[PDB]
Design a protein around this ligand. Structure first.
Ligand SMILES: Nc1nc2c(ncn2[C@@H]2O[C@H](COP(=O)(O)OP(=O)(O)NP(=O)(O)O)[C@@H](O)[C@H]2O)c(=O)[nH]1
Ligand SMILES: Nc1nc2c(ncn2[C@@H]2O[C@H](COP(=O)(O)OP(=O)(O)NP(=O)(O)O)[C@@H](O)[C@H]2O)c(=O)[nH]1
Ligand SMILES: Nc1nc2c(ncn2[C@@H]2O[C@H](COP(=O)(O)OP(=O)(O)NP(=O)(O)O)[C@@H](O)[C@H]2O)c(=O)[nH]1
Ligand SMILES: *CC(=O)N(C)CCN(C)c1ccc([N+](=O)[O-])c2nonc12
Ligand SMILES: *CC(=O)N(C)CCN(C)c1ccc([N+](=O)[O-])c2nonc12
Ligand SMILES: *CC(=O)N(C)CCN(C)c1ccc([N+](=O)[O-])c2nonc12
Ligand SMILES: [Mg+2]
Ligand SMILES: [Mg+2]
Ligand SMILES: [Mg+2]
Ligand SMILES: [Mg+2]
Ligand SMILES: [Mg+2]
Ligand SMILES: [Mg+2]
Ligand SMILES: [Mg+2]
Ligand SMILES: [Mg+2]
Ligand SMILES: [Mg+2]
Ligand SMILES: [Mg+2]
Ligand SMILES: [Mg+2]
Ligand SMILES: [Mg+2]
Ligand SMILES: [Mg+2]
Lengths: 166, 166, 166
């Protein structure tokens, strides 16, 4: 069947692992996954196509990795994640994007901008701020909560839908 | 007379000590109180009741304490302080609240959200952002300046008024 | 001819050196100038006056300097620079201003507030936030991009125009 290789990136603590686990295992982890990389697989039907999603969950740049860029090199599409209550994580997105563009040696890589932790009220990144950033990249902006599940499927499926346009 | 045990918490440098000293001693300290805990008492009439306010001034989580949580355990109400020119301090509030909820073993603790340094123009937390957070907690939001005294009495007296509802 | 002594200050990474090089050498440096101080000169006609601009490019407070304040002491006007995608750099402005006021031993020093990196879409300091800060200081706010050249001449020439009022 059709395999889609997705990679999740973004600043430490934004909820990359929580999002991925919510998608795959349908529960919210309130704890912090100490791993720097992990891999997941989900067989799912997306718009009438039976798909195998291979998802590489990476750690934030704050942590040293084994083979980060080599692992990332294999990705077909990227979720670029920040948290809506963490302004620095939003500001950091541009460096994550630059890293992707370098590692894929292309300025035209399928991507979705994801504002996570939408269940929290201490919001410091307003939706319209994130919409501007996504517009500058020519990509969609989607908000998620790994806690409540809001947007989680939207985010990953939207990324499959971006890959299918490229 | 009636004693109210108040605790001031929040990120380093937000003005917890300055606020407390303004309330008690009616002056503004432009310097940084190096202490990690200190205690104050003020006999005051609040809405026609003669009250003794006992106020524990704590340091931000960035500094190690002796008995922080044990000391905090004794509090009847908490001022959760951030500074309007310090977005991270606002983002940190939720962890302070979580610490309180743990230490009091309750999700229903009297609290007031306080945005300090309202005399400064480098504002990065807008009033309506802080109002949202306070609304999510079911508590009032009040802005203060330890420098000009704006709001300082409002903040502490409002907290006494919250304790009286619980 | 008339010499104007300008000093560029602000947080690390905001683009102080990039701005100065764009003005003097008409190109954008995508790399990071490792120096902690450097000096530039440009002979230019500003509003019909032949001027020599002497510009001291300083490093952010995060880096230790030789003679920072002594060097700064010699300045007639200051560009106080933050980046529009770096909320902390904006919050830091007030300390830069305080340092200037100390070193010049005056509360009436010619200054311009500069929001750099206006070519970037990950904006977290809105124009109206920066306009408030500049208004509190009684100084102009100008946005720049060292990359595209937008505003760069405006910023420096505006500062010459402030010095001429003092
Ligand atoms: N309230 C709330 N908390 C979340 C959400 N997503 C993640 N978190 C929390 O934020 C913390 C960090 O989440 P985690 O998924 O480990 O983040 P990470 O981005 O993978 N970190 P690393 O870069 O170190 O791998 C966890 O405590 C987790 O429960 C969310 O949508 N809502
Ligand atoms: N302009 C202004 N400055 C304030 C205000 N409140 C506190 N400050 C200043 O901010 C600095 C830190 O204040 P302080 O009260 O020591 O903060 P703190 O929260 O107690 N820090 P700690 O967590 O280390 O105990 C002091 O220089 C003080 O003068 C305010 O309302 N306005
Ligand atoms: N996109 C964009 N990048 C900029 C702009 N100005 C500076 N930069 C970038 O930001 C990085 C840091 O710039 P630099 O001028 O060295 O900053 P600085 O303020 O002098 N740093 P220091 O305090 O260490 O001297 C450089 O990579 C540079 O290319 C700008 O207007 N737009
Ligand atoms: C996932 C998360 O952010 N938390 C569970 C908050 C607490 N964290 C991160 C944390 C880290 C490390 C240690 N420790 O080494 O002892 C902690 N002890 O309590 N919380 C800890
Ligand atoms: C209260 C406050 O934030 N200040 C007075 C600003 C200066 N601070 C914090 C500060 C700290 C430590 C030292 N020092 O150890 O030498 C300082 N020297 O000048 N300002 C200092
Ligand atoms: C100017 C700038 O911010 N950059 C070029 C981004 C990369 N930076 C800052 C950077 C710093 C130091 C080192 N290093 O010591 O090896 C780097 N190696 O790649 N980028 C580096
Ligand atoms: Mg993780
Ligand atoms: Mg980690
Ligand atoms: Mg915008
Ligand atoms: Mg599109
Ligand atoms: Mg204190
Ligand atoms: Mg302290
Ligand atoms: Mg809101
Ligand atoms: Mg109420
Ligand atoms: Mg520089
Ligand atoms: Mg430097
Ligand atoms: Mg904002
Ligand atoms: Mg305003
Ligand atoms: Mg003027």
């Amino acid at each position: 069947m059709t395999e889609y290789k997705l990679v999740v990136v973004g600043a430490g603590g934004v909820g990359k692992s929580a999002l991925t686990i919510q998608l795959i295992q349908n529960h919210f982890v309130d704890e912090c996954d100490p791993t720097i990389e992990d891999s997941y697989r989900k067989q799912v039907v997306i718009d009438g196509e039976t798909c195998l999603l291979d998802i590489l969950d990476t750690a934030g740049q704050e942590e040293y990795s084994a083979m980060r860029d080599q692992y990332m090199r294999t990705g077909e599409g990227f979720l670029c994640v920040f948290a809506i209550n963490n302004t620095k994580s939003f500001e950091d997105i541009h460096q994550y994007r630059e890293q992707i563009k370098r590692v894929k040696d292309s300025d035209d890589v399928p991507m979705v901008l994801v504002g996570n932790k939408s269940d929290l009220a201490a919001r410091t990144v307003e939706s319209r701020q994130a919409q501007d950033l996504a517009r500058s990249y020519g990509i969609p902006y989607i908000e998620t909560s790994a806690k409540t599940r809001q947007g989680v499927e939207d985010a990953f499926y939207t990324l499959v839908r971006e890959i299918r346009q490229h």
